[PDB]
């Protein structure tokens, strides 16, 4: 997260860290055995780390659970990043409490102007790499589709939306990939892509979760 602030320990209880010997992506806990992340975060050997604040220190509240299976959306296109969503089933259920909680899936899509909270342990530099020890937060608004499409002509599908600032300086970045964009307590987006990070006129692009609610429910119901 570039230009964000320290969330505060466990203030984002649905945030998870996907780890393979280091933190490589974020995700959101949507129930005690399933996490939603981005398809471009796929790899084998994933350990999901819940209740984290400092990812380099065991401070208490952490629960480390291995992923039993990862389900990349069948129509995921790694070249356009269309359908950039993945579901991870945990080997055992997480113990939910005030520090580890699930976030609700939306019933309707959010409108341009809705203010959302994006969080993660991704890079904090737009120029350079600095990855933080504790979770970073950023409040950002969903932009209009005309603004999004004007910034990324021909690259925005109906399964994406832009959120952020056009002046630059505040954005999610690599490492934040797969993490949550929560608006009015509903998970509306997944950190997906953008041209660099926090560059002017190049807002972040997010997977539009409202378009996948039935796919998520059906998939979870059959696995
Ligand atoms: N600016 C942004 N909002 C953004 C967010 C997530 C990203 N994840 C990447 C990314 C780029 C190349 C290879 C792996 C990545 O996870 N770039 C990103 C950019
Ligand atoms: Ca920790
Ligand atoms: Zn990424």
Described by the principal axes of the CA atoms, the overall outline is: globular
In CATH terms, the superfamily of the largest domain is: Trypsin-like serine proteases
Which architecture of the largest domain does the CATH hierarchy give at level 2?
Beta Barrel
- What order do the SSEs take from the amino end to the carboxyl end, as H and E? EEEEEEEEEHEEEEH
Q: What share of residues are in beta strands? A: 25-35%
Q: Give the count of helical stretches.
A: 2
Question: What percent of the residues sit in helical stretches (DSSP H or I)?
Answer: under 10%
Report the CATH C-level class of the largest domain: Mainly Beta
Q: How would you classify the helix and strand content by structural class? A: mainly beta
Computed Rg: 16 Å
Bound compounds = 2-(2-hydroxy-phenyl)-3H-benzoimidazole-5-carboxamidine, calcium ion, zinc ion
The CATH topology name of the largest domain reads Thrombin, subunit H
Strand order of the largest sheet: 1-9-8-11-12-13-10
What is the end-to-end distance?
Answer: 33 Å
Protein name: Serine protease 1
Active site: 40 (charge relay system), 84 (charge relay system), 177 (charge relay system)
Disulfide bonds: 7-137, 25-41, 109-210, 116-183, 148-162, 173-197
Binding site for Ca(2+): 52, 54, 57, 62
